[PDB]
PDB file of C-alpha atoms and ligand atoms in Angstrom:
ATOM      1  CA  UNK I   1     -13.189  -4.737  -7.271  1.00  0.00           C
ATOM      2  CA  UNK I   2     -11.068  -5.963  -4.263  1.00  0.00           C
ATOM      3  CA  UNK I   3      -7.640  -5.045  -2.695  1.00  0.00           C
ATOM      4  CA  UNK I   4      -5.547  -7.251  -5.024  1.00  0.00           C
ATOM      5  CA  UNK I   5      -7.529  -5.304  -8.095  1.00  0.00           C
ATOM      6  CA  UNK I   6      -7.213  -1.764  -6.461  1.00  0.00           C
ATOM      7  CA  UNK I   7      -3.054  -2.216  -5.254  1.00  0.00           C
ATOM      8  CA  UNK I   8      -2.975  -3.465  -8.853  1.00  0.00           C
ATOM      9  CA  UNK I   9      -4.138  -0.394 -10.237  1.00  0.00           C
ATOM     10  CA  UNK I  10      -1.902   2.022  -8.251  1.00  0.00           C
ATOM     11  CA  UNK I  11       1.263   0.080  -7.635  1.00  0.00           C
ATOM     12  CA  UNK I  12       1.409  -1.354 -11.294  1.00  0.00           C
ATOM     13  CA  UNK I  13       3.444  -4.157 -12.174  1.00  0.00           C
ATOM     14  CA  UNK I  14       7.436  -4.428 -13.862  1.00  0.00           C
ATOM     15  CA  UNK I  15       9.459  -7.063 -14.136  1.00  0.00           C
ATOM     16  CA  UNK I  16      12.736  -5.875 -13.594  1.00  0.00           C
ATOM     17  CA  UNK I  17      14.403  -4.090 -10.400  1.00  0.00           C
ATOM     18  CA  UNK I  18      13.204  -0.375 -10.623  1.00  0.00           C
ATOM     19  CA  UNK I  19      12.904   2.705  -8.630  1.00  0.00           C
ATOM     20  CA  UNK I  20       9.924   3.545  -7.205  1.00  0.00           C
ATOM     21  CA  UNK I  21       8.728   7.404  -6.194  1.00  0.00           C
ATOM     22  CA  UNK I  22      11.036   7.643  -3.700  1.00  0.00           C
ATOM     23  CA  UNK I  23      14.057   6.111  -5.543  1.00  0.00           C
ATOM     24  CA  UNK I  24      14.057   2.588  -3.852  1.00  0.00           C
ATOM     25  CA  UNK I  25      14.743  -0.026  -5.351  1.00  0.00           C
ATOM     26  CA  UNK I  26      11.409  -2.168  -6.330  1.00  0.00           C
ATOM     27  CA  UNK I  27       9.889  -4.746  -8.349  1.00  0.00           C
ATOM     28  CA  UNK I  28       7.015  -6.969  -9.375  1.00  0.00           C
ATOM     29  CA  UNK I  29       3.855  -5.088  -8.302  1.00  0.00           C
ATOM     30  CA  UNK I  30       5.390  -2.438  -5.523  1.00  0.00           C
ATOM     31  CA  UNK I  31       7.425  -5.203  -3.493  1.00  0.00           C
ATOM     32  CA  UNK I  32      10.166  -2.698  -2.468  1.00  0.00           C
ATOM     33  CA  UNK I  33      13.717  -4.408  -2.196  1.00  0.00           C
ATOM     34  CA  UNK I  34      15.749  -2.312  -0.437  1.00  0.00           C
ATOM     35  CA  UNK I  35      16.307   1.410   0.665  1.00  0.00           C
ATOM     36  CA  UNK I  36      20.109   1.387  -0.247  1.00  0.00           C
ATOM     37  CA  UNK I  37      21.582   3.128  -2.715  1.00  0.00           C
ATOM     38  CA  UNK I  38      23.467  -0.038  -4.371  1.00  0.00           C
ATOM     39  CA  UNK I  39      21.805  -2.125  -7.119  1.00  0.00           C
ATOM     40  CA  UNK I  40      23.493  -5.045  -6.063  1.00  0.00           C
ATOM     41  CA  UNK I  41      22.296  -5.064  -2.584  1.00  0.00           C
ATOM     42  CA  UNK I  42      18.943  -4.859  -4.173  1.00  0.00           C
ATOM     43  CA  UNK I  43      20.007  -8.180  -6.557  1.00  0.00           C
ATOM     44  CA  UNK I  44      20.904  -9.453  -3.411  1.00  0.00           C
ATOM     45  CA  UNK I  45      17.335  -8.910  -1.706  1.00  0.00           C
ATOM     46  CA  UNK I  46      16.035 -10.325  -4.887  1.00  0.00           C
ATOM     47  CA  UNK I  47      17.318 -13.601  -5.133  1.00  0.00           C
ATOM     48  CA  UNK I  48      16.926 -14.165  -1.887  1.00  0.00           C
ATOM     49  CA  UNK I  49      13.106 -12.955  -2.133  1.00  0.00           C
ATOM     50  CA  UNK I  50      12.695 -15.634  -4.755  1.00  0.00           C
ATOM     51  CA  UNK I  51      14.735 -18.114  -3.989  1.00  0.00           C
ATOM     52  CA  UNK I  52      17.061 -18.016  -6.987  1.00  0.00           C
ATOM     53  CA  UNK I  53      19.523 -16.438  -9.464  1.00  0.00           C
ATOM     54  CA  UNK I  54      17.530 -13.987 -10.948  1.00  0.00           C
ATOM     55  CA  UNK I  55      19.820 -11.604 -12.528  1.00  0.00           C
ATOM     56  CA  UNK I  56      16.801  -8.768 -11.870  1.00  0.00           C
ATOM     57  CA  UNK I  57      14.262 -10.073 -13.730  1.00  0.00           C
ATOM     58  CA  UNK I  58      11.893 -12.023 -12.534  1.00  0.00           C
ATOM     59  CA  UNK I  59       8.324 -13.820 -14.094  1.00  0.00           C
ATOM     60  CA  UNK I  60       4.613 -12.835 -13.690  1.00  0.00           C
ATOM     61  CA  UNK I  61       4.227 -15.985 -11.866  1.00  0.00           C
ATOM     62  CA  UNK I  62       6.762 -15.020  -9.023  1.00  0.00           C
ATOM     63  CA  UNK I  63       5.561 -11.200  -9.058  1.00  0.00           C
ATOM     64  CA  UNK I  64       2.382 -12.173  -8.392  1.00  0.00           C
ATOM     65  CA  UNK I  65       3.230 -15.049  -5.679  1.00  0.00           C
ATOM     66  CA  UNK I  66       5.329 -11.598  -4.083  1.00  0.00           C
ATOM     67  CA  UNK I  67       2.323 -10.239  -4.222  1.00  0.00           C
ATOM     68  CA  UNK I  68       0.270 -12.091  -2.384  1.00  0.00           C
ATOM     69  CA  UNK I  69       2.807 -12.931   0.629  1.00  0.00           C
ATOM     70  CA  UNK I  70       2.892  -9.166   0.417  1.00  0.00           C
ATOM     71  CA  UNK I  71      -0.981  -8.692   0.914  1.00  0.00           C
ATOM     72  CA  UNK I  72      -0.762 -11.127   3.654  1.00  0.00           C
ATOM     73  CA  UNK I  73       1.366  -9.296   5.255  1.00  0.00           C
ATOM     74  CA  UNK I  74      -0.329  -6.125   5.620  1.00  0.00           C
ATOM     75  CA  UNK I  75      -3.764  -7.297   6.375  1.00  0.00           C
ATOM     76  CA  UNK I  76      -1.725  -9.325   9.145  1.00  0.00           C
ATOM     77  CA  UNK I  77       0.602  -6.091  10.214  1.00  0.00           C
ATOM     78  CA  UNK I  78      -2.704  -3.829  10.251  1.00  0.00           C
ATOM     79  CA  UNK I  79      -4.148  -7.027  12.636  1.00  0.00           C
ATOM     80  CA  UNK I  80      -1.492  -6.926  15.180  1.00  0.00           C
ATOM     81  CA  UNK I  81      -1.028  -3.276  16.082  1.00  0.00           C
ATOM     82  CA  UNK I  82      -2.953  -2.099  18.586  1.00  0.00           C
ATOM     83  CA  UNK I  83      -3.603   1.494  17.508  1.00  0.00           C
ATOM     84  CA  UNK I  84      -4.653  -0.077  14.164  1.00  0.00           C
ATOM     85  CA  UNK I  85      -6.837  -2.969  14.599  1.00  0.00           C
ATOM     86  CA  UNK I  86      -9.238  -1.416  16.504  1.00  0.00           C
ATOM     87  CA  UNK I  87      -9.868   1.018  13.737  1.00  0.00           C
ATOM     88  CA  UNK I  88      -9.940  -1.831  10.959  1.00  0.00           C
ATOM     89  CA  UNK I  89     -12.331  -3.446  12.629  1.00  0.00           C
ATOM     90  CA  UNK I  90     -14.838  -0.887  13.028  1.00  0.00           C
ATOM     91  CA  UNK I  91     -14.735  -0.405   9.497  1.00  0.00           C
ATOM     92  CA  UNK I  92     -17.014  -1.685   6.604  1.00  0.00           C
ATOM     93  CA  UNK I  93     -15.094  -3.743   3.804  1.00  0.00           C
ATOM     94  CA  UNK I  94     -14.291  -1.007   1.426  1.00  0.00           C
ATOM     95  CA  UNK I  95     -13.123   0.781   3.345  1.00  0.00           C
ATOM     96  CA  UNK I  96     -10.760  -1.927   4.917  1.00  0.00           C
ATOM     97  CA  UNK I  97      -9.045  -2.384   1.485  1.00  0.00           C
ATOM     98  CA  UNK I  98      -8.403   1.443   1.526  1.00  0.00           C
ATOM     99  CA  UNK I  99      -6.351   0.989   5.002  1.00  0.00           C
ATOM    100  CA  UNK I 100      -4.715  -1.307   4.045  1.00  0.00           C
ATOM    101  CA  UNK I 101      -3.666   0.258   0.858  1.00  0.00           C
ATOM    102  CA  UNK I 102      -2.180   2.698   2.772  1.00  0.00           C
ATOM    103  CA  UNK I 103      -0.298   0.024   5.173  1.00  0.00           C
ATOM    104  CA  UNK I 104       0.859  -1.949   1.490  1.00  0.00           C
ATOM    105  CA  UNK I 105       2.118   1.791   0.621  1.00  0.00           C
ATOM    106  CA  UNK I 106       4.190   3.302   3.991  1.00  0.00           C
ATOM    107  CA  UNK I 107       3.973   0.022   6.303  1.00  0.00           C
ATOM    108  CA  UNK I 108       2.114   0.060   9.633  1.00  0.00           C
ATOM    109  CA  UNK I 109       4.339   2.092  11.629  1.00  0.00           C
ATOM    110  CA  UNK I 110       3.767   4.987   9.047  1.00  0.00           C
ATOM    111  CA  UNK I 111      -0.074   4.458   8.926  1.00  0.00           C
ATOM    112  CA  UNK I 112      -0.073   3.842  12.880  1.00  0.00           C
ATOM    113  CA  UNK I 113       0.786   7.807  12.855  1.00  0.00           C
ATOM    114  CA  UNK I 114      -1.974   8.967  11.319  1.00  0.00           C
ATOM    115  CA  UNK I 115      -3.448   9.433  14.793  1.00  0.00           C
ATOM    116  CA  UNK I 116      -5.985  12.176  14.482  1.00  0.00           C
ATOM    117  CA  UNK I 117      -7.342  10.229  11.188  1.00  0.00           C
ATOM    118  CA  UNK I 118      -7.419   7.244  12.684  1.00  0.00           C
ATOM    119  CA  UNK I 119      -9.588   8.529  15.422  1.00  0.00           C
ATOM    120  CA  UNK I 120     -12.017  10.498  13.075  1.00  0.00           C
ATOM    121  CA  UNK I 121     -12.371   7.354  10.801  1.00  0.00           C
ATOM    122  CA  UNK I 122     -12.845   5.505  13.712  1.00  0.00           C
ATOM    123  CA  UNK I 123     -15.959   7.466  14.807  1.00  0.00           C
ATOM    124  CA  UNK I 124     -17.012   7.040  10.726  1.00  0.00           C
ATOM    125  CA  UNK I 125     -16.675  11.026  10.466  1.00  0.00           C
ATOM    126  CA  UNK I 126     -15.832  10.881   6.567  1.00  0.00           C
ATOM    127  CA  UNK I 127     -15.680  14.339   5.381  1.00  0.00           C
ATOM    128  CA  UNK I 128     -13.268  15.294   8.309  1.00  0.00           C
ATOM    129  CA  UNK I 129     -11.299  12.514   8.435  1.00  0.00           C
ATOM    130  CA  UNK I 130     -10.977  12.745   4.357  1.00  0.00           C
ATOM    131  CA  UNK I 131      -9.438  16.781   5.357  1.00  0.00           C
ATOM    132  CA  UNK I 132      -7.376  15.457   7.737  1.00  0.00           C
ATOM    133  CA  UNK I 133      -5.848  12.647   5.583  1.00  0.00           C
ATOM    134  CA  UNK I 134      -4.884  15.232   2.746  1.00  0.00           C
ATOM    135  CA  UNK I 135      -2.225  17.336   5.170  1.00  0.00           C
ATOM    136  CA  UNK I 136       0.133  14.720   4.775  1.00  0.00           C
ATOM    137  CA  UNK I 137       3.306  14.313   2.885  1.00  0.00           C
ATOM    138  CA  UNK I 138       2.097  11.052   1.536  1.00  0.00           C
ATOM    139  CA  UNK I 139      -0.813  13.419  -0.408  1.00  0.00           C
ATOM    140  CA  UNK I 140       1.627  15.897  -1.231  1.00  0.00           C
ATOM    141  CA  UNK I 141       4.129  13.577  -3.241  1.00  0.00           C
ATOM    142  CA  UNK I 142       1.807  10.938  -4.499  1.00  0.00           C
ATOM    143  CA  UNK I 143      -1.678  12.956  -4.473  1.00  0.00           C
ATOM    144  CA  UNK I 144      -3.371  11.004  -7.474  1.00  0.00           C
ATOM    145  CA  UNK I 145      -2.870   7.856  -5.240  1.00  0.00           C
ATOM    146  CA  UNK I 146      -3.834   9.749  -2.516  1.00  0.00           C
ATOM    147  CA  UNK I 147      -6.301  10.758  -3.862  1.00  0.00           C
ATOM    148  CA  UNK I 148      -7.796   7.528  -4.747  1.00  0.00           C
ATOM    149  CA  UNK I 149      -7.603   6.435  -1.730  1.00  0.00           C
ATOM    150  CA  UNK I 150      -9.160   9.321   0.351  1.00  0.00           C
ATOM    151  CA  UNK I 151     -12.165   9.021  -1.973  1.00  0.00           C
ATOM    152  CA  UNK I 152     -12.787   5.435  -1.360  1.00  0.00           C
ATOM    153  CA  UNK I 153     -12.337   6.193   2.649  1.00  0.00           C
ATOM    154  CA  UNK I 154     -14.771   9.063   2.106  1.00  0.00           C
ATOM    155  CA  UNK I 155     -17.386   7.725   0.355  1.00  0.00           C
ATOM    156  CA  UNK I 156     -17.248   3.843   0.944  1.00  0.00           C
ATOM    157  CA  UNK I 157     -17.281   2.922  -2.454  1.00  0.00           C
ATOM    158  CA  UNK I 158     -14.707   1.945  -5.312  1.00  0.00           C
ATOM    159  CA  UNK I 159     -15.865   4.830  -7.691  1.00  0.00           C
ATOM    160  CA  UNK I 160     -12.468   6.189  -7.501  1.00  0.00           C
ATOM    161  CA  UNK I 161     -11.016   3.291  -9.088  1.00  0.00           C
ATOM    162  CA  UNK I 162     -14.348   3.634 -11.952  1.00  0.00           C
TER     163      UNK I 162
HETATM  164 CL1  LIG K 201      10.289 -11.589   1.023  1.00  0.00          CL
HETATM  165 CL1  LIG K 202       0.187   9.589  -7.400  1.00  0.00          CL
END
């Protein structure tokens, strides 16, 4: 299993503009368009995303490429912020895919809030930091994800994901 695998698994993968949990406009495997309300601002985002007239439908081949620049990104976000990187860093590789799951999911900014579970992952306090995650709004709305995800910063492993 790796981070490609596991975001995979809970992002799925549909290739035509849809809306995601929240209502947003999305595509491909969870590469969110846009936040407005108008499907052609989101047909808009697309073609520019992939450099053509695309009509909302797009190929495996260019989900997946949006997939990858997407995966870059976060790993790269999660690198540059400072209340982040310290914490990746301190953490073993599992694990890393798990924060950055959660920067894929809500963006850095988002994750960069999670101060108090930052700080108990940080000292590798597990249990507490697995509490802590779970009184979030991100648990309440999308708690099997959340779930997942907890478990595998919990426990270090990827039985969450079998
Ligand atoms: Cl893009
Ligand atoms: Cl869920």
């Amino acid at each position: 299993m790796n981070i490609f695998e596991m975001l995979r698994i809970d992002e799925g993968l549909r290739l035509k503009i849809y809306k995601d949990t929240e209502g947003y406009y999305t595509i491909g495997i969870g590469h969110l368009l846009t936040k407005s309300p108008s499907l052609n601002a989101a047909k808009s985002e697309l073609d520019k995303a992939i450099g053509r007239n695309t009509n909302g439908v797009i190929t495996k081949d260019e989900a997946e490429k949006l997939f990858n620049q997407d995966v870059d990104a976060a790993v790269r976000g999660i690198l540059r912020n400072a209340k982040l990187k310290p914490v990746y860093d301190s953490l073993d590789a599992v694990r890393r895919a798990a924060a950055i799951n959660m920067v894929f999911q809500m963006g850095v900014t988002g994750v960069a809030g999670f101060t108090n579970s930052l700080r108990m992952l940080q000292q590798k306090r597990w249990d507490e930091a697995a509490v802590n995650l779970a009184k979030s709004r991100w648990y309440n709305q999308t708690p099997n994800r959340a779930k997942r995800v907890i478990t595998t910063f919990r426990t270090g492993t990827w039985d969450a994901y079998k």
